Amino acid sequence: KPHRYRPGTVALREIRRYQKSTELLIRKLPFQRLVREIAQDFKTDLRFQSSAVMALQEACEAYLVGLFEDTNLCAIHAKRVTIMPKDIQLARRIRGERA
Amino acid sequence: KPHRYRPGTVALREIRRYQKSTELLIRKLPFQRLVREIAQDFKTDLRFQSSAVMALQEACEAYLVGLFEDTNLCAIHAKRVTIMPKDIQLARRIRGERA
Amino acid sequence: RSRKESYSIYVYKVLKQVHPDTGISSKAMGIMNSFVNDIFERIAGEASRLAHYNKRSTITSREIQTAVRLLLPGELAKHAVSEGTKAVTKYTS
Amino acid sequence: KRSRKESYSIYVYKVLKQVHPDTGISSKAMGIMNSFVNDIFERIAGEASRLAHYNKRSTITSREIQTAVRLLLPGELAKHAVSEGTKAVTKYTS
Amino acid sequence: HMALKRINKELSDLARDPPAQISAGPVGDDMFHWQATIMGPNDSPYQGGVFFLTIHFPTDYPFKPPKVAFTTRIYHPNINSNGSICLDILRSQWSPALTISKVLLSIASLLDDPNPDDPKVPEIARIYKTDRDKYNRISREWTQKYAM
Amino acid sequence: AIPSLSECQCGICMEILVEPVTLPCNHTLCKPCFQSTVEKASLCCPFCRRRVSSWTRYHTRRNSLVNVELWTIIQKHYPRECKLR
Amino acid sequence: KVLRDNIQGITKPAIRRLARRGGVKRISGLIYEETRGVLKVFLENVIRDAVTYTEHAKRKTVTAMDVVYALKRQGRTLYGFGG
Amino acid sequence: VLRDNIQGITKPAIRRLARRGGVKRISGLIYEETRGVLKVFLENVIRDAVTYTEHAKRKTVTAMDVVYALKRQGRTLYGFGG
Amino acid sequence: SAKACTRSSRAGLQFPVGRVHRLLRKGNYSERVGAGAPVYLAAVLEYLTAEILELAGNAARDNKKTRIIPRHLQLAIRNDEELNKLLGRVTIAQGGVLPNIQAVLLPKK
Amino acid sequence: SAKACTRSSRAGLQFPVGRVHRLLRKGNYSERVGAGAPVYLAAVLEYLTAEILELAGNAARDNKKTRIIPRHLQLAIRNDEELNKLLGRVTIAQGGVLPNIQAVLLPK
DNA sequence: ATCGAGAATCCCGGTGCCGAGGCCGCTCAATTGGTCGTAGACAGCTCTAGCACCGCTTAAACGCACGTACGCGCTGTCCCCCGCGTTTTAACCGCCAAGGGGATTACTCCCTAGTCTCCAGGCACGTGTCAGATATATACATCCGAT
DNA sequence: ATCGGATGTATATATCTGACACGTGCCTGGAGACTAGGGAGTAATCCCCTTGGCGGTTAAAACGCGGGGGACAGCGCGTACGTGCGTTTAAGCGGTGCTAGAGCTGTCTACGACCAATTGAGCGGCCTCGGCACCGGGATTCTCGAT
Ligand SMILES: [Zn+2]
Ligand SMILES: [Zn+2]
Structure with a gap:
């Protein structure tokens, strides 16, 4: 009686919707708190301009999107549709981050 | 009665022998001819110093060695031991050379 | 407050020359200004390095032309060189 | 006679004899050492000049070189190089 | 602190068996400034030459080398009018x-x-x-007109 | 054989060895002397003059400077003057 | 006012949204920890250079220009925040 | 005049490079792709080398030009000058 | 030319010749600066800006809007091949990404 | 330090202070150069060179050799993690490759 | 679990060669001394915005139940690189011969930094207004179980 | 191979709001005429080395065969993750208050640029002897078919 989609269709719909738009995808306050926590280790009692946090978030989101774009290709290369940590490690090693 | 090594045990010997040696691997005159034929297209009647040709050869060898290392990593990732052109294409795409 | 310089007016004039009807927002102005600064820095630095290699101590038009040839890809290089040569020829007389 | 050419060969040889009293170096490796020294000098000088220009300044003092060293070299190398340079400057001024 | 203790122990070591043709001693109550008299070597053009030198100890020791200055004026390739000796041990590999x-x-x-x-x-x-x-x-003329 | 107080000392300060560090050249001295020398002296072994900056650079990350195998023994067999200093 | 383990603020739905934008159809259950670790490493690397830049200039507030300069130095130029 | 010299990169000359790289078993289609990518890389380097040579109003490609081109491409080389 | 009007108009350019010349002269690039370098540099900059602005305007017209936004600039830069190769490492804030899905992921027919 | 002696010896250094000063002046880096920057730069350069030379000498002595061929330099650079990170993109002439074989390829 | 024959690799010893380390002559760049325009270190004031808090939403996150589809291990087939032996091909070393253009020096000129004076182009500031984001209500594309 | 629900996406219309485009003051930087000096264009010349060619020998490339091992196709398990609903949580927006600190301005002194004289640190050219390259001999050490 109830109506529900097969596994996968909602994933494709979400992919289309998120590639169509441009808004940010990480909540602002948790990311700001994480950035402040990381920064307070290097030098205590720091202050952040309202634009530095936004620039950091933009850079991190772009880097993560690129990393997942490469990870999808890495996963598809092995006759799989699921991404797992070994794919991320292989992509990072090839890209030269830790080679 | 003839003695034949098992398939895949001379390859390891070659790897061990070549990783410990440092000479150039490509013949000098064929590479000189290739470089001259490539360069004469951009500007006719050019002259090459020997040092420039040697530098080109050694840089090309280093680039090919790195590319084959990445290709071997990609091939091992896909539960294989052979290396195939799709591995080379994937490695070049991840490295950003082709994109 | 003090004077802060930018390429806003020139970019707006170029846009009006190309597209008479369309308009441009502030974020696009920032992006275009940053891109122009980046390309200017790249070209000027490459020209300075090219001048230093040849033991010369000046940056003439030909060094900027060679820097543009080195930096930009094959298809854009021809048009950029043609535009620069045309501008120099018109300016010199 | 050929024109004069400049290289860091003699200084590298002095350092090598300072660390290894009985180990010589080949010319093909002396060239590599010279290229390494030139590349590191160029990197540090360019970074320091860029840093000086970003603060609307017109002088490359020891502070700019030190911050460029901190930015460029990895952690332990940066710490050791900063300590060595500070010691050298202190010894030079006094 | 540790520097003063080391100064005292080295003074005791010098007292128990002083080295030949050299004798050093503190100027007064303080231990930082010392004066030393040295006799010229026999196989030298400086025969019979007695030389007075002054050594100054910094606040930290031995981690900085002490500063040495020859009181008299000598004609030696590694000495100047200021009395400082161009020795790598004194500044480089101390x-x-x-x-x-x-x-x-x-x-x-x-x-x-x-x-x-x-x-x-x-x-x-x-x-x-x-x-x-x-x-x-x-050198003989200089050491005869200076040391004697 | 256990080493006595005569064969276990820091020659730099001529004081009883405390939390020592052992160089690859088999020369041992107490840690504060090592720190002050590595940042302020000529960055070499004071005894045999061997460059050791690579060794300390490698061992600083993992905190393997101290030679506990001898430090613990010296502290255990000489509790009195270790408590005094 | 110390802050502890705020890296958990990058929740699983945010990582799934980022992967969906990146073009991933199905995600394993162990991806989240690896993504958090990579993000932490990248943030540490960028913020160290940002703090060095703001400390060479004798200030106490990091500006967006310092972040842009650090990103450019690391090889990832960013438009839209001056330069 | 010279043409069709790309075959100078022989099959053993690529097998040796693969063995140095750490490859155990090789397919049969790798050689053509390797020749293609090597040709692309050589063209990319030679374009900048020829530009450097022509800017200085010269006619010989000095190794310094090759080193500068490699450094510009992001593949700095040590040993031949600089 | 008649050397009576502005230097920017004297070369048929909308970018400022004087500002570029001052930036080259005082930018710590070389001891001397030629008289023809700023004109060439300004012409190149104007050509590149005009190309990108034209592509962005076309993308805006395709999307039925009339104000250029960073998404339009990102689309224009990434769609073209020459500018994509030129701006390989540039990250554009609030620019989104090209819409694409791999062929394997799409459902079977 | 006491004056009236060469600059390269006042700091106890081995690299030339004057040549580094001239290069900084005439390298188009900045309009003015301070008096203390060349000493710090020369000290950093000499420290890095000493590190690389010491590692290369150890590598050469491991091979029963009394000369440092470029292969020893490559081994010294690659083996150390910090120098490898500093010189990741650099290619050493005739340096070969640090020997390694994947565990999967080895026979069972 | 092993014995043993056959093949690749390392140690060792002797012989010869060429290039690296030391030395000499010399030319030019670093030193030292002195003078002078100015860069920034510092004290002081201003006023912006970064931080802190409080109250109210409702949007996103968390937990859990259910089902299915895909990662994975296993099995079987075939075909294709690997190891080896034989033969043809051109690389590599040494040699000779020539001339081209890379490098250097000398001469001269005109291009551009530097100076001062004059004026207008663009930046900070302010204000009117419509492009677009939003709400609201329909038309159509598409997914899923089952004939 | 579709049919009909059912969901979500796509489409047509009012609306109102704040960011975009334009008017204005003016002042700081850009433009114009003149001067002097050195950096670069141009002509001659030397000789370094790059191109061209021959002869030989031989290490490497080309070619063909036998075959074992690896790629790949298919199948069954079941476990992990997609999908959806109910509930709890902290992000988000508004509104206000406070002050730490970025930012701008006047002083003037110490640090650095500039230039003449000069000599010693450093570079070009020679050379010789020892560390390294090469060859012969044997001991060492994996390897594989046979048990
Ligand atoms: Zn001690
Ligand atoms: Zn020792």
């Missing part, structure tokens, strides 16, 4: 484990034979390199 006895014997050895590798003033170094006889005579 070690905390090294004692003042070692540096004093090194200075005595430099008196016996000089080093032309890195002289402070090279004019008298090449003077030494040119001819031995007239360098010997001028």
